């Protein structure tokens, strides 16, 4: 697909940041190496459900004033294409496949089959969690349902699973044409308190490590690489300075389009014609 | 000022950037917000859910 690393990072960082900040012992583990008073002050101010201060995330160049006490500024950077395929053919498909998804589901009995229902039509099934079927189990997929023979499996009549699968758009042939790009995004934790900037740096590094395992950047946005700048005053001529430490996140990812092929051939036919010269 | 309002900010109240002495205008996508539906305490803004 076409991709937007900045919007991915914003969408991914915001919930993760919230879920760490609402959970005190996580911060208590992340900041174990800092000075005791720095740790306790940060945990008192920003952390837990009762926290009176709050962190914020957003892109650069807003028209309004931000929460300069603690704010992650996201800032789309450079990139370059790095590796190309022969013919620019990144892949080919017989059935137009969408995004990868993971969904929780439960088995149910139906007509002496077990079935799992999924919210969308299954274009491909990658894994039913914790199950490997035998041929006897007569595994079949149909529409948005996975179906599974009941006879030997009655104990599992309410078994709970996670389905990893991917959508289908439509039944069509084509070529995925495109290339790989290596692209940079900068993130900086602004604070007018230097110890807050240092803690926001630690929290961001933890978040990015945790992010490396996510499906989003396992399937796309691969090879996350981190670089770190000096701590410096971002703005120097207010009633106080504003500090931050930049980090650069670099990703390798595919830019591509679905070139559908309308041509289809369904029968050869043969004829002999005679040359009398 | 402008703020996006979410469940946390409803429950906890928006901490305002400025030390508001008084409000001269307040509005949302649905129109003006009437004074029975907002309150300021301790420089926090509380809104009707």
């Amino acid at each position: 697909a076409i991709t937007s690393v900045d919007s991915y990072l914003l969408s991914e960082i915001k919930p993760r940041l919230n879920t760490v900040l609402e959970n005190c012992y996580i911060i208590d583990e992340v900041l174990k190496d800092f000075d005791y008073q720095t740790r306790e002050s940060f945990k008192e101010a920003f952390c837990g459900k009762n926290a009176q201060h709050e962190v914020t995330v957003g892109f650069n160049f807003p028209k309004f004033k931000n929460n300069y006490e603690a704010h992650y500024l996201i800032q789309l950077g450079q990139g370059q294409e790095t590796k190309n395929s022969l013919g620019s053919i990144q892949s080919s498909y017989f059935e137009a496949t969408g995004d990868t998804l993971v969904e929780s589901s439960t088995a149910i009995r139906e007509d002496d089959k077990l079935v799992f229902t999924v919210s969308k039509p299954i274009g491909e099934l990658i894994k039913v969690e914790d199950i490997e079927f035998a041929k006897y189990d007569n595994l079949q997929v149909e529409g948005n349902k996975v179906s599974f023979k009941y006879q030997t499996n009655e104990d599992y009549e309410n078994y709970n699973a996670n389905i990893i699968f991917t959508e289908k758009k439509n039944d069509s042939k084509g070529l995925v044409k495109g290339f790989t790009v290596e692209e940079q995004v900068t993130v900086v934790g602004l604070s007018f308190n230097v110890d807050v900037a240092r803690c926001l740096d630690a929290v961001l590094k933890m978040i990015l490590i945790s992010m490396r395992d996510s499906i989003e950047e396992q399937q796309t946005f691969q090879l996350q690489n981190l670089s770190f700048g000096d701590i410096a005053p971002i703005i120097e001529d207010g009633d106080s300075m504003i500090f931050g430490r930049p980090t650069i996140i670099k990703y390798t990812s595919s830019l591509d389009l679905d070139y559908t092929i309308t041509q289809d051939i369904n029968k050869l036919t043969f004829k002999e014609r005679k040359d009398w010269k | 000022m402008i703020y996006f309002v979410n469940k946390d900010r409803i429950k906890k109240g928006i901490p305002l950037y400025y030390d508001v002495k008084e409000i001269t205008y307040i509005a949302t996508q649905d129109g003006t917000v009437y004074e029975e539906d907002y309150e300021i305490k301790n420089n926090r803004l509380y809104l009707n859910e």
Binding site: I235, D239, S240 | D19
Partner: peptide, 12 residues
């Protein structure tokens, strides 16, 4: 210089 960056309550 004006107190924009860090903003504190009025004394009363």
């Amino acid at each position: 210089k004006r107190e924009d960056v860090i903003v504190l309550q009025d004394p009363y």
